[PDB]
Amino acid sequence: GSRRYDSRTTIFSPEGRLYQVEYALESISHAGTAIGIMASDGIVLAAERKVTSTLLEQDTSTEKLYKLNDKIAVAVAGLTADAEILINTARIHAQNYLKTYNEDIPVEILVRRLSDIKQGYTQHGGLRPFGVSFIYAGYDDRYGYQLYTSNPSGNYTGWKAISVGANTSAAQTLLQMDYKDDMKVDDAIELALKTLSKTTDSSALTYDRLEFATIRKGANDGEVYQKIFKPQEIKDILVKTGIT
Amino acid sequence: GYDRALSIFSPDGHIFQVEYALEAVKRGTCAVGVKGKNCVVLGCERRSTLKLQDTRITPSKVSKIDSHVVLSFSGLNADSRILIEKARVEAQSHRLTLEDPVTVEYLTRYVAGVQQRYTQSGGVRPFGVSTLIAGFDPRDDEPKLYQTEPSGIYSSWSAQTIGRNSKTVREFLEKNYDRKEPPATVEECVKLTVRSLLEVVQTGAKNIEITVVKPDSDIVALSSEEINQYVTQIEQEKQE
Amino acid sequence: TGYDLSNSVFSPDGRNFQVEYAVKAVENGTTSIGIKCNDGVVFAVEKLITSKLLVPQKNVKIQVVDRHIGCVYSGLIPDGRHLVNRGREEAASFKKLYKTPIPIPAFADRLGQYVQAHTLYNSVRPFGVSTIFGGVDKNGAHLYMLEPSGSYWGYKGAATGKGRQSAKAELEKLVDHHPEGLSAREAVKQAAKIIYLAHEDNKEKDFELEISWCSLSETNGLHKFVKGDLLQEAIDFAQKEIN
Amino acid sequence: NNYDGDTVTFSPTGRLFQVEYALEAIKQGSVTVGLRSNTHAVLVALKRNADELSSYQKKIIKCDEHMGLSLAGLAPDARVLSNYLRQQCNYSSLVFNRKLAVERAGHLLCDKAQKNTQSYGGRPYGVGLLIIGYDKSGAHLLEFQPSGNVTELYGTAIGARSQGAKTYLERTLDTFIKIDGNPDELIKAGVEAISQSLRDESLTVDNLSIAIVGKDTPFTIYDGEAVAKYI
Amino acid sequence: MDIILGIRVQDSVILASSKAVTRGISVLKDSDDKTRQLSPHTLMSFAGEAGDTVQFAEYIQANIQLYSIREDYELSPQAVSSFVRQELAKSIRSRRPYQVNVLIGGYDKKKNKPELYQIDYLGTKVELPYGAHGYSGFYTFSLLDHHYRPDMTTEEGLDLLKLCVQELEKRMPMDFKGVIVKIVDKDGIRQVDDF
Amino acid sequence: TTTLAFRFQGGIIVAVDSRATAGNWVASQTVKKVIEINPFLLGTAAGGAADCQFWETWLGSQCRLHELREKERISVAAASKILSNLVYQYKGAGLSMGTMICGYTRKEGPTIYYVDSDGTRLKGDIFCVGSGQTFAYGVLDSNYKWDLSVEDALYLGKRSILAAAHRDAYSGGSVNLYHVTEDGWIYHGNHDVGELFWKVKEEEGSFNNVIG
Amino acid sequence: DRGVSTFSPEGRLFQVEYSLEAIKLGSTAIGIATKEGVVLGVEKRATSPLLESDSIEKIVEIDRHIGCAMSGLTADARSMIEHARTAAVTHNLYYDEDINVESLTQSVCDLALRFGELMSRPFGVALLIAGHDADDGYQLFHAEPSGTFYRYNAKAIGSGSEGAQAELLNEWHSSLTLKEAELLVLKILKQVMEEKLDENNAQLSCITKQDGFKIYDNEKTAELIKELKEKEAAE
Amino acid sequence: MTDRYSFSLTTFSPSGKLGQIDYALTAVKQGVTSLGIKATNGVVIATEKKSSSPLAMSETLSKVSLLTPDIGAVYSGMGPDYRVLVDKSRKVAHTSYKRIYGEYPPTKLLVSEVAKIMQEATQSGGVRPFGVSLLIAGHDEFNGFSLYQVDPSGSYFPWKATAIGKGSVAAKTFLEKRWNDELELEDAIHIALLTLKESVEGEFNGDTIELAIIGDENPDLLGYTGIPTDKGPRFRKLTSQEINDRLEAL
Ligand SMILES: *[C@@](C)(CO)[C@](*)(O)[C@H](Cc1ccccc1)NC(=O)[C@H](Cc1ccc(OC)cc1)NC(=O)[C@H](C)NC(=O)CN1CCOCC1
Ligand SMILES: [Mg+2]
């Protein structure tokens, strides 16, 4: 019958590894680098677009950074199509929690549920896992500003500063060097860009090959604002830090 | 529905998928359980290749199943969440029907049953997780420590360890733990647990987690400085 | 290659090797025939007497569908029974909805589609039988032969099994020598002869003859078995021709 | 070789190897004999044990007051098929107030075994059965094979070394068929028949298993000291 | 079941609930506690159809306790009340709805404010300074309209509650065998044993 | 029916009548309304007869499975809650059951639980259940003290059923007495009202409404 | 790969035969049947000295009149025991009587072949089911994952099974007392066990008509071990 | 019987590649060239009508399809896969949007729904990916004119101008030289015809070229009058005659 053609996506190797999860991570390591940095007064999300063409419409484009709700955003690394499936699920889950409890969803709860969905694809169903790694950047009134990451295994962890996608090894060493705990947002903005600028496979880092976002309490009194940077705003912030 | 029999026998009488799930446990960070005269202590390793972590929000290694029972593990982290969740749901369901919290033996038996079901169900792989379940039965002061594994077998232990380099720390516990006289106090039990982890860990900084469970839902996690004091004390006595 | 390991897989030729392999099981089976006549059809089959311990006349192979259709097959006997069980269900639902008994061409397609369906998926095996069947309806007499692929045509005479070529040659002579037509009682006698002649290709074990027929005049359009005096008369006619 | 992975696959010569391997499980099974006259039908079965400390595996199963079988091969598969027969015999009684014909009993078993040989996932039955019974057309004996093929006979035998008993019955055909109105003599003929399949071992009191059905005799099984008469 | 009251004061929420369980012409029990602790700083009283009441209360209790263990965190009274409402809002369009009315008294530790929610079996939620279910409200609401002040102490609240129980004991047709009173504040939940 | 069970100094008394009715037709006078679940658990039956008989014997099977699985005798609370959760699933379907789960365990001590077919489940010291519950309450309440002796408590239970058996048209036959201690339940005999009434009347001097 | 319910050329089910190999790796379990009762004994086999041996539950009660000992992948036995207990109690509910030991065994063995592509594989555990009923008296059954069961006067399963079975062949007679049978299980267990036999690494049990199924204490078994050693030295 | 293929036929290889998606892209490469150019006041999409036989009527085979009155689509790769996608895309625009909001979906969201369908064929049981790349041009009130590309993986990108299929590499280079942000619609049509002539080999006329625009509203193509807010479809397929007129002043 059909047994002949089954890849058996949810099995263990003799060494006790999940073949498909390992290979999904190998796929993600070729995707454009995404960095998350958490400061005391906000969070930075920076991501490098995958080899851009000059005729690509830059201003009306979304590849790396996605909004989950007013308080939570994610940076993507891997298959965009796969990520969008998961993002819409996450967006719905957030609205269910709000509808149930009349309170915005705590960041960890949202992250856990999304990570639990990925886990299921590695244990049952005989389907391939999602070839996606997320950086979650969000705020709630329990833990404040939080950074998380999840990967195809469905395992998630919390971070002060983290990178996913390509050149994470080099990127994580640079972040580990210059990061400190009393850091501000504007300093974290500078760190994020400097790190990408050194780890990039491109010749020079330009405005048209970047997506940028901040989550500050920089609104008026005790409330959080999400800023998805416009092309011209990235151009200005790139000049202001002296990269171009 | 995906039906494939993934866990099956081999000519020599082995179920390789279950045995390979044990290899995943062997890869996982070390976890140790030691029970004293009036307490149980769960110690856990945390690998130090991860700096720039946020320890406030990062999932803790020891999980409360109920107010009186805890569960630590070694193996795949994502898999462990599924077992912990099921266990937590069963704990509340038991309180609802029996009007009494679960015994540690019962909770262990349930988790072990779930693990076993995944070894002879179609379309699923076994859990790549072994657990240490510890606590005190309702209105009882006798300490309980149990172990489970992917196959589904479970058993009670005076002291036990699982995960990477567990055979080294088990060797330590086998000669250092006296059945006739277990650790009489909390301090003695925690020290023996930290000592056993120091055979394997590396540095006693932010690499060791300790959770102490006492009778009548008295569970607390030790901070860095509190654990560091045991590390400092043990090393000074060692130089002799 | 490996194109022959799974059913419903096309080879580079455009062939389904699994169906062709089922045909080999049919060729291995005992001989069975069908003869179309003036106002009906006649079916006959070879039953190999494996042992003295077989009860004579009590291992019946020819099967009736509804009250007006007869079915006989060569190859895997159980597969043939499964097909007739379906045929009986198909005929029953037709009569349930449309009142009239199922016409033979209509019935032929019902089996044809069902057998063809078992060449569409790898989760099922093709049928290991060629089925000769037919009867009498409002438009007269019809004889059909259905194959593992689902292929069927109408026939003047039909034959399948180990002695099919011998039987086909003998059938072709009847078609040539009787252009105006063959009578029902004649066809029964000829059927006996052709089974006896076709037995030369399976002559280690001696055999038992079994005949059935549908005829507008002789059986009133219903399927009946040939027994007793009419059967012995047909056996004697066949015995006289081989010598 | 490459065409024996499952039952849904034909070989290049048109063989079903999984069905043939199931047939092989019957040849490994212990011998059992079936025979009949015009008044009675008899099953004789050589039971097998694991060792001297173990019991002797029961071979004969009752299906109705007028019908039952003996088995050779996988015993659990015989239990499944005998249970199906029990239901079908029972359905015929409750709905139609009619004792199920032994011939229909065979047809039903054939069709049940067949479905398992044409579908992916399933497997053929790994057992052969000898069904005896007395119905409205007198005594009957059937031979079931898990290929689906069912055969009505005067006498037969299946299992290991069954060829010895089958030859004897082929010689004795004219004698035992006319043992009418005499149960003990028909059993004696069956006990003598199964004896032709014995090697090194002989028929003992807890080794032999006999069953009989007939005109004024319900399907009853004899074991233990009740078969000491026939040794 | 029958009488359940609630009063929110400056620093606490006080719930009063009748002790009688009647069935036919017999008072089967006179010491019944018509409440369940959902979390350390959240208490739910209930009244309605026999069986449904306890079955619903314990079901909610199990769910909130499950959440507490999972997140190692106590849900706010507002969050618990919204969860309860939604369960009742589902219930009302079920094959057999829960016929249970509830009062949810809680202390929000983040806001340092007491909160009282009144939810009926339809899933109709309202935050109130004082609340009641059943026929009780026809006496207590007008009484509290007069005597209630927002800045009252817990002791003043208990005297205000005594005034309600006295009025109900005077004018209600049925003997409800007194009430069990419980106080919800910053220090959790405690029972007044002598009322 | 009339069934009662009360808690006191010396354990639990349980007393039931033995009449079955089909309208005004007296169906039986010799029915067993107490089911012995195990040496430490009793169950009383009031309401629909098949409903009680079927589900209380079923309850016993669930209690047996508990002690097989858990290697420990089931608690009175857990036993009662199995039955209450069961009938709650059938709520509205028309089950008619008024039950009392009485027994002793180490952790609980002597315990009585009232469970009925609307899903009401109540712990308590005294309960009377059935058509004649009010008649039993009248005698039991007016004579009850915690400090009753085993001898006096047994009699009060017996006398309370007799009182209801007399007045309630749908109660009677005979009295079945039980006593539950730390060591388990003890059966204290079947007492026919035919003889018991006159024996009580003469010795006690009560029942002066009746023609002596 | 290949189908789960596939036959070998010799006419055996691959998966069933492979599960039998798993059972040979398991710890030893022995059962002996007498007219005074049936005795069940097992090797506990703790993997480490820190493991509390009393938590090793390889002898199990099904009903008051039926007991059970296991060997192999013991985790697989949980659902088999659960089914057996339910079958026994359910039959008591439907028929107001104790269920026959043979009927119970048959019910358990019906689960065995309910696997394929139902559960994904056969059970990797063998069971010794011992009990008593009014009809056929004291009985001992060996239930395999093949779906087959044999009644035995005495039977050993596990790693030391073939050596222990040959010993039981010589020692068993129809007039054995219960005390004689108890010692005989201890004797044969001590012979096939790796580590030295004592009350902590071996467990005894029995089923009698009068007292039903009882697992022996470590204190009671210890005295039977001491009584056994003295009797062997006495000649 | 029954679909026993409940498992993924597209899986990760050791190198991290998803084979079936890569192979689907290879099929798109073999396909005939199609392109899209965005202007200030409109969008143009175009492709060659590769005729299977001269006896075949190429008018009956439509490579450029209307999805909504303001959205059109064109492809490169396997035609049958495209045909069913257009059916599904038309339906999803109604079921998941118009039947809810009473208006047609904006270009980006319809594209998003089509991408979802193509992604599921990459992960679901017993199915291969779609062997096509789509170019979807459209207009909506709040986003204006837009042009999107959708690949077999389910990924989609917005473009100022692009080309896919056979000679896409050369065609994209040609468009980079000619494209500016001040292009009027007529200028974009002119450039589209120039770009397409490079990839086409045989005949180059209105009968071998298929071209449609997303431009001004067309009241004459609405089919009715009387509702001022309904002003007609912005999608218009250029006729064979209309193409030839622009080929003279080429
Ligand atoms: C006293 C006598 C008042 O009825 C008790 O409640 C008694 C309790 C009892 C317990 C165990 C065994 C016997 C008796 N109950 C009855 O005797 C009971 C009264 C009753 C009848 C119908 C009811 O509706 C559900 C409720 C209570 N009598 C019966 O159950 C009689 C013997 N059987 C029937 O009426 C048969 N009915 C039952 C309902 O369904 C239709 C058939
Ligand atoms: Mg009366």
- Asked whether C202 and C163 are in contact (CB, 8 A), the reply is yes
The reply to whether ligand 1 has any atom less than 6 angstroms from the CB of F53 is yes
Give me the amino acid identity at E54: V
Residue closest to C171 by CA, chosen among C62, C45, C21, C33 = C33
Pairing status of strand D40-46 against strand D208-214: antiparallel
Using the Cβ of B142 and the Cβ atoms of chain F, whether some distance falls under 8 Å is answered with: no
Contact between D14 and C125 using a beta-carbon 8 Å cutoff: no
| Residue D120 structure tokens | 């992916």
Nearest 5°: phi and psi at B41? Answer: -125, 130
Q: Is F77 annotated as a binding residue?
A: no
List, in order, residues 6 or more apart from D229 with CB less than 8 Å away: D184
D-chain CB neighbours of G9 within 8 Å are 4, 21, 24
Question: What gap in Å lies between CA F75 and CA D12, rounded to an integer?
Answer: 68
**3-state SS assignment for residue G8:** coil
H-chain CB neighbours of B3 within 8 Å are 6
Half-sphere exposure of C4 (CA within 13 A, CB side): 14
E-chain CB neighbours of B66 within 8 Å are 69
Pairing status of strand D208-214 against strand D217-222: antiparallel
For residue E134, count CB atoms less than 10 angstroms from its CB and return exposed for 0-12, middle for 13-18, buried for 19 or more: middle
**3-state SS assignment for residue E75:** coil
List, in order, residues 6 or more apart from D95 with CB less than 8 Å away: none
Nearest 5°: phi and psi at A91? Answer: -60, -40
G50 secondary structure, DSSP code = T
Q: Please give, one letter per residue, the 3-state secondary structure of G67-122.
A: EEEEEECHHHHHHHHHHHHHHHHHHHHHHCCCCCHHHHHHHHHHHHCCECCCECCC
Nearest 5°: phi and psi at D192? Answer: -70, -30
Give the residue, by CA position, lying nearest to ligand 1 atom 36: F22
Residue C197 CB coordination number (10 Å): 18
Radius of gyration of the CA atoms of chain B, in A = 18
Looking at chain D, the residues that come just before a C–N gap of over 2.5 A are none
Q: Please give, one letter per residue, the 3-state secondary structure of chain D.
A: CCCCCCCCCCCCCCCCHHHHHHHHHHHHCCCEEEEECCCEEEEEEECCECCCCECECCCEEEEECCEEEEEEECHHHHHHHHHHHHHHHHHHHHHHCCCCCHHHHHHHHHHHHHHCCCECCCCCCCEEEEEEEEECCEEEEEEECCCCCEEEECEEEECCCHHHHHHHHHHHHHHHCCCCCCHHHHHHHHHHHHHHHCCCCCCCCCCEEEEEEECCEEEEEECHHHHHHHC
Hey, where are the domains in chain B?
1-240
| Residue G143 structure tokens | 């239930």
Nearest 5°: phi and psi at C206? Answer: -75, 165
Question: What gap in Å lies between CA A76 and CA A131, rounded to an integer?
Answer: 10
Residue closest to D108 by CA, chosen among D79, D136, D83, D127 = D83
Residue closest to B38 by CA, chosen among B140, B143, B178, B182 = B143
Q: Which chains touch A (3 or more CB pairs under 8 A)?
A: B, C, D, E, G, H
| Residue B34 structure tokens | 């030691």
Class of domain C1-243: alpha beta
Closest partner CB to G116 (pick from D26, D27, D121): D121
Which helix H or strand E contains C235, and what residues bound it? helix C228-242
| Residue F60 structure tokens | 């016993």
Q: Edge-to-edge strands of the sheet including G66-72?
A: G59-63, G66-72, G125-133, G137-143, G149-151
Residue in this structure with the two tokens 């029954």, named with its chain if needed: H2
- Asked whether H106 and H119 are in contact (CB, 8 A), the reply is no
User: E1-195 maps to which CATH number?
Assistant: 3.60.20.10
**3-state SS assignment for residue H232:** coil
Fold of the domain built from segment(s) D1-231: Glutamine Phosphoribosylpyrophosphate, subunit 1, domain 1 (3.60.20)
Question: What gap in Å lies between CA D181 and CA E145, rounded to an integer?
Answer: 105
Method of determination used here: X-ray
Most B CBs within 10 Å: which of A7, A11, A12, as the mutation test of the B interface?
Answer: A12
Half-sphere exposure of D30 (CA within 13 A, CB side): 20
Angle at C74 between CA C71 and CA C80, to 5 degrees: 55
Which positions of C are catalytic?
30
Domains annotated on chain A, with CATH: 1-244 (3.60.20.10)
Using the Cβ of H172 and the Cβ atoms of chain A, whether some distance falls under 8 Å is answered with: yes
Sign of the torsion angle spanned by Cα atoms H138, H143, H149, H153: negative
Touching, F vs D (3+ Cβ pairs under 8 A): no
Question: What gap in Å lies between CA H40 and CA H46, rounded to an integer?
Answer: 18
Contact between D52 and G169 using a beta-carbon 8 Å cutoff: yes
E strands within H95-220? 132-140, 144-150, 156-158, 161-164, 209-214
Ligand 1 centre from F20 Cα, in Å? 6
| Residue F130 structure tokens | 């059935």
Q: Edge-to-edge strands of the sheet including A42-48?
A: A161-164, A34-39, A42-48, A210-216, A225-228
Nearest 5°: phi and psi at B87? Answer: -60, -45
Kindly report the nearest CA distance between residue E178 and chain B, in angstroms. 27
Domains annotated on chain G, with CATH: 1-235 (3.60.20.10)
Nearest 5°: phi and psi at C47? Answer: -115, 110
- Asked whether G29 and G154 are in contact (CB, 8 A), the reply is no
- Asked whether F180 and F139 are in contact (CB, 8 A), the reply is no
Using the Cβ of B106 and the Cβ atoms of chain F, whether some distance falls under 8 Å is answered with: yes
| Residue D171 structure tokens | 């010689």
Nearest 5°: phi and psi at A216? Answer: -110, 165
Give the residue, by CA position, lying nearest to ligand 1 atom 40: F48
Residue closest to B74 by CA, chosen among B24, B119, B40 = B24
List, in order, residues 6 or more apart from D28 with CB less than 8 Å away: D73, D160, G10, G11
B59 secondary structure, DSSP code = P
E strands within chain E? 4-8, 13-18, 21-23, 26-29, 35-39, 42-48, 100-108, 113-119, 125-127, 130-133, 179-185, 188-192
The reply to whether ligand 1 has any atom less than 6 angstroms from the CB of F52 is yes
Question: What gap in Å lies between CA F28 and CA B120, rounded to an integer?
Answer: 54
Question: What gap in Å lies between CA H227 and CA H246, rounded to an integer?
Answer: 34
Give me the amino acid identity at A143: Y
Beta bridge partners of F6: F13, F126
Ligand 2 centre from F100 Cα, in Å? 22
**3-state SS assignment for residue E126:** strand
Question: What gap in Å lies between CA A235 and CA H177, rounded to an integer?
Answer: 24
C-chain CB neighbours of D17 within 8 Å are none
Residue E11 CB coordination number (10 Å): 17
Half-sphere exposure of C44 (CA within 13 A, CB side): 34
Nearest 5°: phi and psi at D108? Answer: -70, -40
Question: What gap in Å lies between CA A54 and CA H159, rounded to an integer?
Answer: 10
| Residue C236 structure tokens | 């004697």
For residue H159, count CB atoms less than 10 angstroms from its CB and return exposed for 0-12, middle for 13-18, buried for 19 or more: buried
The reply to whether ligand 1 has any atom less than 6 angstroms from the CB of F47 is yes
Residue G173 CB coordination number (10 Å): 9
Hey, where are the domains in chain H?
1-250
Residue in this structure with the two tokens 């397929």, named with its chain if needed: H237
Per-residue b/e over A32-61, b at no fewer than 16 CB within 10 Å?
Answer: bbbbbbbbeebbbbbbbbbebeebbbbeeb
Residue closest to F87 by CA, chosen among F125, F126, F113, F124 = F113
Give the residue, by CA position, lying nearest to ligand 1 atom 3: F1
Which helix H or strand E contains F133, and what residues bound it? helix F133-143
Residue closest to B76 by CA, chosen among B29, B15, B8, B110 = B29
The reply to whether ligand 1 has any atom less than 6 angstroms from the CB of F48 is yes
Question: What gap in Å lies between CA A158 and CA B46, rounded to an integer?
Answer: 14
Looking at chain C, the residues that come just before a C–N gap of over 2.5 A are none
- Asked whether F183 and F40 are in contact (CB, 8 A), the reply is no
| Residue B41 structure tokens | 């202590």
Question: What gap in Å lies between CA A107 and CA A144, rounded to an integer?
Answer: 9
Contact between A160 and B82 using a beta-carbon 8 Å cutoff: no
**3-state SS assignment for residue B33:** strand
Instruction: Please choose from F21, F52, F97, F171 the residue to mutate so as to test ligand 1's pocket, defined by most ligand atoms within 8 A of CB.
Output: F21
What was the resolution (in A) of this experimentally determined structure? Answer: 2.8
Question: What gap in Å lies between CA B158 and CA B35, rounded to an integer?
Answer: 6
Pairing status of strand A144-150 against strand A156-159: antiparallel
Longest CA–CA separation in chain B, Å = 64
For residue F145, count CB atoms less than 10 angstroms from its CB and return exposed for 0-12, middle for 13-18, buried for 19 or more: exposed
Q: What DSSP string runs through E80-115? A: HHHHHHHHHHHHTTSSS---EEEEEEEEETTTTEEE
Correct CATH for B1-240 of 3.60.20.10, 3.40.47.10, 3.30.70.260, 3.50.40.10:
3.60.20.10
Question: What gap in Å lies between CA B30 and CA B199, rounded to an integer?
Answer: 11
How many residues are present in chain B? 240
List, in order, residues 6 or more apart from B120 with CB less than 8 Å away: B7, G76, G115, G119, G120, G121, G123
Residue closest to C106 by CA, chosen among C63, C68, C163 = C68
Sign of the torsion angle spanned by Cα atoms F16, F19, F21, F27: positive
**3-state SS assignment for residue E28:** strand
Class of domain F1-212: alpha beta
Ligand 1 centre from F179 Cα, in Å? 26
Which helix H or strand E contains A186, and what residues bound it? helix A185-199
Hey, where are the domains in chain E?
1-195
CA distances from H168 to H28, H83, H125 (A): 11, 22, 32
Contact between B81 and A13 using a beta-carbon 8 Å cutoff: no
Q: Edge-to-edge strands of the sheet including E35-39?
A: E35-39, E42-48, E100-108, E113-119, E125-127
- Asked whether H158 and A56 are in contact (CB, 8 A), the reply is yes
List, in order, residues 6 or more apart from C90 with CB less than 8 Å away: C102, C107, C110, C111, C114
Kindly report the nearest CA distance between residue E38 and chain B, in angstroms. 13
Residue closest to B116 by CA, chosen among B26, B28, B7, B5 = B7
Question: What gap in Å lies between CA G27 and CA C10, rounded to an integer?
Answer: 53
Which helix H or strand E contains A97, and what residues bound it? helix A80-101
List, in order, residues 6 or more apart from B225 with CB less than 8 Å away: none
Question: What gap in Å lies between CA C159 and CA C36, rounded to an integer?
Answer: 12
Q: Edge-to-edge strands of the sheet including A156-159?
A: A65-67, A72-78, A132-140, A144-150, A156-159
* Chain C residues 123-142 with CB within 8 Å of chain H: 123-124
B-chain CB neighbours of G4 within 8 Å are 5, 8
**3-state SS assignment for residue F152:** helix
Contact between C124 and H2 using a beta-carbon 8 Å cutoff: no
Residue closest to B89 by CA, chosen among E87, E74, E63, A113 = E63
Contact between E50 and F120 using a beta-carbon 8 Å cutoff: yes
CB pairs under 8 A between B and H: 6
User: H1-250 maps to which CATH number?
Assistant: 3.60.20.10
Give the residue, by CA position, lying nearest to ligand 1 atom 27: F48
List, in order, residues 6 or more apart from E190 with CB less than 8 Å away: E182, E183
Q: How far apart are the first and last CA of chain H?
A: 60
Residue H33 CB coordination number (10 Å): 22
Question: What gap in Å lies between CA C110 and CA C92, rounded to an integer?
Answer: 12
